[PDB]
């Protein structure tokens, strides 16, 4: 079987879409978020930056939000709870509890050894490498749908997976190819 005994992954960012189940009046939500930016012309939502869970929140009039910058699910839960309470403080009432869905997870990691990307680019099927533009090999994992950036140092960046087990599977699939040589 494929040797993952040296693989190490670290969560760097978690992106979640959330549904508060309430119509939001963005002009009134601005007072709730200190420093918030809102230009409805260029982008429909408020760009809010929280300090405690240090995360960015994109707030929409449909009561939907996107939370990014989260290092954990707990980061997201707490951001939603703080905003939800602030909203309540301004009159908002919600039809039900917040629906939280992780949409994207970015991991950084190490696969165990170094690589001569020139060789990898010529042996690993379905990968991209353009050192004139970027120093890593771009590898698209079909299932589970995700991308892994592989560097000469053996460090990697996995994006797109929506769970930890998926990212581990994506790395397992890449290591299956790399280990044939």
């Amino acid at each position: 079987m494929v040797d993952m005994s040296k693989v190490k992954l670290r969560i760097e960012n978690i992106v979640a879409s959330v549904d508060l189940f309430a119509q939001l009046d963005l002009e009134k939500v601005l007072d709730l978020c200190p420093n918030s930016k809102y230009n409805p012309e260029e982008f429909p939502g408020i760009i809010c930056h929280l300090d405690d869970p240090k995360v960015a929140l994109l707030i929409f009039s449909s009561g939907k939000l996107v939370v990014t910058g989260a290092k954990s699910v707990q980061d997201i839960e707490r951001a939603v709870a703080k905003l939800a309470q602030k909203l309540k403080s301004i009159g908002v009432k919600f039809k039900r509890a917040p629906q939280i869905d992780v949409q994207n997870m970015v991991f950084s990691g190490d696969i165990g050894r170094e690589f001569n990307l020139d060789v990898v680019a010529l042996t690993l099927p379905n990968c991209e490498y353009e050192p004139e533009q970027f120093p890593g090999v771009i590898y698209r994992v079909k299932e589970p749908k995700s991308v892994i950036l592989l560097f000469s140092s053996g460090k990697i960046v996995c994006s797109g997976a929506k769970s930890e087990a998926d990212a581990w599977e994506a790395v397992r699939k890449l290591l299956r190819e790399l280990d044939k040589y």
């Binding site: 001569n116 020139d118 050192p131 004139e132 890593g136 000469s152």
Partner: peptide, 11 residues
């Protein structure tokens, strides 16, 4: 190249 000092660097 032989001494593996080029990987990742721009041409």
């Amino acid at each position: 190249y032989k001494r593996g000092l080029t990987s990742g660097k721009s041409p």
